[PDB]
Design a protein around this nucleic acid. Structure first.
Lengths: 48, 53, 48
DNA sequence: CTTGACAAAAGTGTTAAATTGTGCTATACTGGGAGCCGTCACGGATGC
DNA sequence: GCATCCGTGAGTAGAGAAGCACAATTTAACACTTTTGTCAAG
């Protein structure tokens, strides 16, 4: 059944219990932004 | 250049090809005004210290 | 200040490249429409 | 607005210790050392 | 003509082991004025 409408899904759905892992790649550790910051010594370009 | 032009008239293809290689280098110096002995360094330029910090 | 960013200037990396090319005993000079030398170092590398 | 004079701040000339640069060691000693390796195709030249 | 050595190139992000003597030069501790800066006086 669809929780939004209460009507059934028009076809039977494969529903079961499966083992799912949470991986080390998390958006918390990967989101980054910068307006201005440190620059390189020689090229004077922003660091990485 | 004059000597290399004379060798350019040689009937051997290899001789003309070798003369062309030399004459391209010779004409490059003549047209640009570069002086061939400048390819040997007497004073070595030193890079500014902030580029080698 | 609420203003538009000004017109950009020569990158500092190009200045680095020119000086590094000069360290290789190569005379790299920027010219104008009339083939006259143009100073991209703001007179800071010209000896008097 | 000038004293004015006055102490702090700063400059300055010596003098010392400290740091730094240089010379010198007299049995005889006389040609180094580490690598050494599993890519492949491509010009370009260099001679054969 | 061909065979060989050398030179070139081979994706982008991010994350990651001598002492010692002595001279010569410099530093730092002093003293010294000399100089600004300042709070009384009109």
């Amino acid at each position: 059944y669809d929780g939004r409408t209460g009507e059934p899904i028009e076809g039977p759905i494969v529903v079961g219990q499966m083992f799912i892992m949470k991986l080390y790649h998390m958006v918390e550790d990967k989101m980054h932004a910068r307006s201005t910051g440190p620059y390189s010594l020689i090229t004077q370009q922003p660091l990485g | 250049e004059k000597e290399l032009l004379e060798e350019m008239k040689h009937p051997s293809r290899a001789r003309r090809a070798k003369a062309r290689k030399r004459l391209e280098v010779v004409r490059a110096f003549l047209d640009s005004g570069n002086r061939p002995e400048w390819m040997i360094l007497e004073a070595v330029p030193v890079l500014p210290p902030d580029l080698r910090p | 200040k609420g203003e538009d960013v000004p017109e950009p200037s020569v990158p500092e990396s190009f200045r680095v490249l020119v000086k590094e090319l000069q360290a290789l005993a190569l005379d790299v000079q920027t010219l104008d429409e009339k083939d006259n030398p143009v100073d991209i170092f703001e007179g800071l590398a010209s000896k008097r």
